[PDB]
Design a protein around this ligand. Structure first.
Ligand SMILES: Cc1cc(N2CCOCC2)cc2[nH]c(-c3c(NC[C@@H](O)c4cccc(Cl)c4)cc[nH]c3=O)nc12
Length: 127
């Protein structure tokens, strides 16, 4: 079995910016979720080989994880906050699509998503 290549975190011809909203997504949103006791399954791409999930990437065609998001933020890969918010939502949705309600991994995603929603509720107005 094989894992796909990870999502892109560098692309020199992609336009990019450093907005105050993207700064908040790194300093507040990512930092808060990354330190959480339930962050560990989401800190890197799903290793479907080691986890013995050969169907994972047959079902999940838009993978995303906080390790990739962290690199994208630190590399200033994004043009706007919506692109980064979409990455977080893709992460959570992938977990809910693949797994079953009440599974440990779903409870973990739900705890992180609740904090994500609380932080993005106070995304600053664009400077
Ligand atoms: C091992 C395993 C089994 C199953 N099935 C259970 C019953 O049916 C047969 C197979 C589904 C899985 N889903 C993921 C998964 C992740 N695993 C991280 C791993 O360290 C892990 C492994 C177990 C629990 C946790 Cl909390 C974390 C990370 C992100 N998204 C995911 O979906 N792992 C699964």
């Amino acid at each position: 079995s094989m894992n796909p290549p990870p999502p892109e975190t560098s692309n020199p011809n992609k336009p990019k910016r450093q907005t105050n909203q993207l700064q908040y997504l790194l300093r507040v949103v990512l930092k808060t979720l990354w330190k959480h006791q339930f962050a560990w399954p989401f800190q890197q791409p799903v290793d479907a080989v080691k986890l013995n999930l050969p169907d994972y990437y047959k079902i999940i065609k838009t993978p995303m994880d906080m390790g990739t998001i962290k690199k994208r933020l630190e590399n200033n890969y994004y043009w706007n906050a919506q692109e980064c918010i979409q990455d977080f939502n893709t992460m959570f949705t992938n977990c809910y699509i693949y797994n079953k309600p009440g599974d440990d991994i779903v409870l973990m995603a739900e705890a992180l998503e609740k904090l994500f929603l609380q932080k993005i509720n106070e995304l600053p107005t664009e400077e």
